[PDB]
DNA sequence: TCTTCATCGCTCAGTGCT
DNA sequence: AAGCACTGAGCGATGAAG
């Protein structure tokens, strides 16, 4: 019946790792998009300085 | 003692809730910025159709 | 009714901070 | 030094899928 415990242990390890990695994934996505967002906003202001950038599209945290 | 167990049980609950809440937070942030990213990219194409899309800022998936 | 396994709550044994 | 909040992880109970 020790096998039942080892199988049980492995599953737990996988589940916890899956959640931790999912956490990092949304972090990596948010970081990458945030970088673009900053890159895009400036380039938009450069081409069309008269347009209000933060007025039409609010800057979302973080 | 029972006291040691009860405090740690509450702490464990708080800890699991903290991570779950952290995940939702990073999800909500990732979604919002992705939304902003799309909102920005579109407004860019409308104002300057001549500009090359994905060239200056590569469009990451998700 | 009985496996199989993903999730998770309880517990132990630390870890880090002060 | 030593109490405190916090958490990694083994364990067992539960849920969900076959």
Short mmCIF file of C-alpha atoms (C1' of nucleotides) in Angstrom, two decimals:
data_model
loop_
_atom_site.label_atom_id
_atom_site.label_comp_id
_atom_site.label_asym_id
_atom_site.label_seq_id
_atom_site.Cartn_x
_atom_site.Cartn_y
_atom_site.Cartn_z
CA UNK A 1 0.00 0.00 0.00
CA UNK A 2 3.13 2.17 0.00
CA UNK A 3 2.66 2.51 -3.77
CA UNK A 4 -0.64 4.30 -3.15
CA UNK A 5 1.23 6.92 -1.12
CA UNK A 6 3.97 7.41 -3.71
CA UNK A 7 1.41 7.86 -6.48
CA UNK A 8 -0.42 10.25 -4.21
CA UNK A 9 2.76 12.17 -3.53
CA UNK A 10 3.64 12.57 -7.16
CA UNK A 11 0.24 13.90 -8.03
CA UNK A 12 0.48 16.47 -5.34
CA UNK A 13 3.86 17.56 -6.56
CA UNK A 14 2.57 17.90 -10.06
CA UNK A 15 -0.51 19.83 -9.07
CA UNK A 16 1.36 22.28 -6.95
CA UNK A 17 3.99 22.75 -9.68
CA UNK A 18 1.25 23.22 -12.28
CA UNK A 19 -0.25 26.05 -10.24
CA UNK A 20 3.12 27.68 -9.55
CA UNK A 21 3.99 27.56 -13.25
CA UNK A 22 0.56 28.88 -14.20
CA UNK A 23 1.26 31.75 -11.82
CA UNK A 24 4.55 32.51 -13.60
CA UNK A 25 2.86 32.24 -16.99
CA UNK A 26 0.37 35.03 -16.27
CA UNK A 27 3.27 37.03 -14.86
CA UNK A 28 5.28 36.56 -18.04
CA UNK A 29 2.29 37.44 -20.19
CA UNK A 30 1.43 40.56 -18.19
CA UNK A 31 5.06 41.69 -18.27
CA UNK A 32 5.45 41.24 -22.02
CA UNK A 33 2.20 43.04 -22.85
CA UNK A 34 2.99 45.86 -20.42
CA UNK A 35 6.23 46.40 -22.31
CA UNK A 36 4.43 46.58 -25.60
CA UNK A 37 1.81 48.89 -24.18
CA UNK A 38 4.53 51.34 -23.18
CA UNK A 39 6.28 50.88 -26.54
CA UNK A 40 3.03 51.43 -28.42
CA UNK A 41 1.82 54.49 -26.48
CA UNK A 42 4.99 56.48 -27.17
CA UNK A 43 5.10 55.58 -30.86
CA UNK A 44 1.46 56.65 -31.14
CA UNK A 45 2.22 60.02 -29.56
CA UNK A 46 5.19 60.44 -31.90
CA UNK A 47 3.10 59.98 -35.05
CA UNK A 48 0.02 61.85 -33.81
CA UNK A 49 1.02 64.31 -31.04
CA UNK A 50 -2.38 66.06 -31.12
CA UNK A 51 -4.28 62.92 -30.12
CA UNK A 52 -4.72 62.42 -26.38
CA UNK A 53 -3.30 59.00 -25.54
CA UNK A 54 -4.33 58.57 -21.91
CA UNK A 55 -7.70 60.24 -22.44
CA UNK A 56 -9.09 57.83 -25.02
CA UNK A 57 -7.29 54.75 -23.71
CA UNK A 58 -6.65 54.72 -19.92
CA UNK A 59 -3.39 53.23 -18.67
CA UNK A 60 -4.21 49.98 -16.91
CA UNK A 61 -2.23 48.88 -13.82
CA UNK A 62 0.17 47.51 -12.86
CA UNK B 1 -0.46 21.48 21.92
CA UNK B 2 -3.85 22.17 20.34
CA UNK B 3 -3.12 25.91 20.31
CA UNK B 4 -0.11 25.44 18.03
CA UNK B 5 -2.23 23.44 15.58
CA UNK B 6 -5.17 25.85 15.46
CA UNK B 7 -3.02 28.90 14.70
CA UNK B 8 -1.09 27.08 12.00
CA UNK B 9 -4.31 25.76 10.45
CA UNK B 10 -5.61 29.33 10.09
CA UNK B 11 -2.21 30.37 8.73
CA UNK B 12 -2.24 27.55 6.18
CA UNK B 13 -5.72 28.61 5.04
CA UNK B 14 -4.55 32.21 4.76
CA UNK B 15 -1.54 31.09 2.76
CA UNK B 16 -3.53 29.04 0.23
CA UNK B 17 -6.02 31.88 -0.14
CA UNK B 18 -3.12 34.29 -0.70
CA UNK B 19 -1.76 32.31 -3.66
CA UNK B 20 -5.18 31.74 -5.24
CA UNK B 21 -5.86 35.45 -4.92
CA UNK B 22 -2.44 36.18 -6.38
CA UNK B 23 -3.24 34.04 -9.42
CA UNK B 24 -6.54 35.79 -10.07
CA UNK B 25 -4.78 39.13 -9.73
CA UNK B 26 -2.15 38.23 -12.32
CA UNK B 27 -4.92 36.91 -14.58
CA UNK B 28 -6.93 40.12 -14.31
CA UNK B 29 -3.82 42.19 -14.99
CA UNK B 30 -2.80 40.06 -17.98
CA UNK B 31 -6.30 40.33 -19.43
CA UNK B 32 -6.55 44.10 -18.96
CA UNK B 33 -3.19 44.83 -20.59
CA UNK B 34 -3.97 42.42 -23.43
CA UNK B 35 -7.18 44.39 -23.86
CA UNK B 36 -5.23 47.65 -23.78
CA UNK B 37 -2.72 46.19 -26.24
CA UNK B 38 -5.47 45.44 -28.75
CA UNK B 39 -7.12 48.80 -28.16
CA UNK B 40 -3.80 50.51 -28.81
CA UNK B 41 -2.80 48.47 -31.87
CA UNK B 42 -6.12 49.22 -33.56
CA UNK B 43 -6.03 52.96 -32.94
CA UNK B 44 -2.53 52.91 -34.40
CA UNK B 45 -3.72 51.31 -37.64
CA UNK B 46 -6.58 53.79 -37.96
CA UNK B 47 -4.39 56.89 -37.62
CA UNK B 48 -1.42 55.60 -39.62
CA UNK B 49 -2.44 52.84 -42.10
CA UNK B 50 0.97 53.22 -43.79
CA UNK B 51 2.87 52.14 -40.66
CA UNK B 52 4.05 48.52 -40.62
CA UNK B 53 2.28 46.50 -37.93
CA UNK B 54 4.19 43.99 -35.78
CA UNK B 55 7.40 45.42 -37.29
CA UNK B 56 8.27 47.95 -34.57
CA UNK B 57 6.61 46.05 -31.73
CA UNK B 58 6.34 42.32 -32.37
CA UNK B 59 2.90 41.06 -31.45
CA UNK B 60 3.29 38.40 -28.81
CA UNK B 61 0.69 35.71 -28.65
CA UNK B 62 -1.93 35.44 -25.95
"C1'" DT C 1 -19.04 -0.67 -6.53
"C1'" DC C 2 -14.27 -0.25 -7.48
"C1'" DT C 3 -9.88 2.34 -9.85
"C1'" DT C 4 -7.35 6.37 -11.23
"C1'" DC C 5 -5.81 10.80 -10.37
"C1'" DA C 6 -6.22 16.13 -9.74
"C1'" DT C 7 -7.24 19.23 -5.97
"C1'" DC C 8 -6.82 20.58 -1.65
"C1'" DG C 9 -7.13 20.87 3.66
"C1'" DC C 10 -4.52 19.30 7.88
"C1'" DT C 11 -0.16 18.68 9.82
"C1'" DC C 12 4.87 18.83 10.48
"C1'" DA C 13 9.23 21.05 10.05
"C1'" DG C 14 11.28 24.11 8.96
"C1'" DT C 15 12.49 29.45 6.84
"C1'" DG C 16 12.92 34.24 7.25
"C1'" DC C 17 12.40 38.42 9.85
"C1'" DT C 18 12.99 40.97 13.74
"C1'" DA D 1 17.74 34.36 21.10
"C1'" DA D 2 13.47 33.36 20.27
"C1'" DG D 3 8.77 34.23 19.15
"C1'" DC D 4 6.14 35.22 15.11
"C1'" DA D 5 3.80 34.83 10.41
"C1'" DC D 6 4.45 32.31 6.45
"C1'" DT D 7 4.98 28.17 3.41
"C1'" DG D 8 7.08 23.85 1.16
"C1'" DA D 9 5.48 19.36 1.05
"C1'" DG D 10 3.80 14.48 2.83
"C1'" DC D 11 -0.30 12.69 3.98
"C1'" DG D 12 -5.12 11.54 3.59
"C1'" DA D 13 -9.94 12.73 2.27
"C1'" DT D 14 -12.80 14.47 -1.48
"C1'" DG D 15 -14.25 15.22 -6.27
"C1'" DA D 16 -14.29 14.08 -10.81
"C1'" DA D 17 -13.57 11.01 -14.82
"C1'" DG D 18 -13.23 5.99 -16.83
#
